[PDB]
Amino acid sequence: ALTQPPSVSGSPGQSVTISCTGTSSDIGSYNYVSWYQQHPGKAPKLMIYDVTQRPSGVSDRFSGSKSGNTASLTISGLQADDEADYYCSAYAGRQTFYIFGGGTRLTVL
Template sequence: QSALTQPASVSGSPGQSITISCAGTSTDVGYSNHVSWYQQHPGKLPRVVIYDVTNRPSGVSDRFSGSKSGNTASLTITGLQAEDEADYYCKSYMVTKTYVFGTGTKVTVL
């Protein structure tokens, strides 16, 4: 199972919006609505910010939103803040009942 494809880096100024893409295939992102997104600050454990494509766990800012079209999922962060600077990973359930992570995206707040 190959990793889902994400851009290596995305940057934006405070207050701006950014979108991170997560490209897969018909056997993972295209197959399943169980796509989640994880935020990982350096040296810290990952935490989920979006699950099931569009849902936010309690405690996660509503500046985070998710979507999916075909084999590509996306994470959008609006009103970018310094604390959003981190690595972000998508993860998808697969037709084989296993999971696969994306390659990861480093978000930089300029």
């Protein structure tokens, strides 16, 4: 599937990057990566779609990028309310379709 660091941490006000690594057929060939934020309970919310786009309703604190076969989501100026499990996904193809990744428990310090 897609490899994603099990957890990342940092203090309030610092930036953090959550990487996601796939293969050439998944992230490299297709610029259709996306990121979801899932607080315990409730349901995952869309944070980032495409390499650099975000949906309406999400502030510019959340951004991301893609280089080679690695995707990364960057959150600047972390707030206490960001303690959630983040997931990456990408469009693999018309055969395997969407392949998600493990969860990055973000625990702000």
